[PDB]
């Protein structure tokens, strides 16, 4: 199945970028998201994974939140 | 239509005892959300006690109550509930159900949540 757009891509035709998570483990269930000002962590539910090796996409992204967990992810490279 | 939640099971009870907490949500697509309860001790700020998939088959806990809370939900009649066992006095708290603004997510993070019943009330003491 597919799940929804971490962010819209301005240049081809309905082009939107998702987020997966990769994993060795079959049986995740939620992702953590340390939010970037360190006020808590935000959960987000997946998907049923896929095997290639475990693939899960993220349902719990949203219009909004998309900000938390873009921000989350940056605060984590560095 | 607004989120309302009612929160009930709590009281006066002994260390080393239970309780009980219930929460019926009224007015969301419950079986959509990751419901979840915090706890506000008098003095301490709201902390985040336990959290509940929409699905029920997957749990996360504060590791201060790991062990010894267990948190279910019934997502036919819209409840969820938080089974308290191995009571402690730290424990004393006013006990918030929790519904996020969106479905399929949670936050440990009390700020991001604004459907906020009344809490009830849990005392462990002699």
């Known amino acids: 199945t597919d799940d929804n757009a971490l962010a819209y891509y301005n240049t081809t035709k309905g082009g939107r970028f998702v987020l997966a998570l990769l994993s060795d483990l079959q049986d995740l269930k939620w992702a953590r998201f340390p939010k970037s000002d360190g006020t808590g962590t935000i959960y987000t539910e997946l998907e049923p994974p896929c095997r290639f090796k475990y693939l899960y996409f993220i349902k719990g992204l949203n219009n909004l939140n998309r900000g938390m967990v873009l921000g989350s992810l940056a605060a984590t490279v560095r | 239509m607004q989120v309302q939640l009612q929160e009930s099971g709590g009281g006066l009870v002994q260390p080393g005892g239970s309780l009980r907490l219930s929460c019926a949500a009224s007015?969301?697509?419950?079986?959509?959300?990751?419901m979840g309860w915090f706890r506000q001790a008098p003095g301490k700020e709201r902390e985040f006690v336990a959290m509940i998939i929409s699905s029920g088959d997957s749990t996360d806990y504060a590791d201060s109550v790991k062990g010894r809370f267990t948190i279910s939900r019934d997502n036919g009649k819209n409840t969820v509930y938080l089974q308290m066992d191995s009571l402690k006095p730290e424990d004393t708290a006013v006990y918030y159900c929790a519904a996020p603004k969106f479905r399929y997510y949670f936050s440990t993070s009390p700020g991001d949540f604004d459907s906020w019943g009344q809490g009830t009330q849990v005392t462990v003491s002699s």
């Open positions: 007015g969301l697509a419950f079986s959509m959300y990751t």
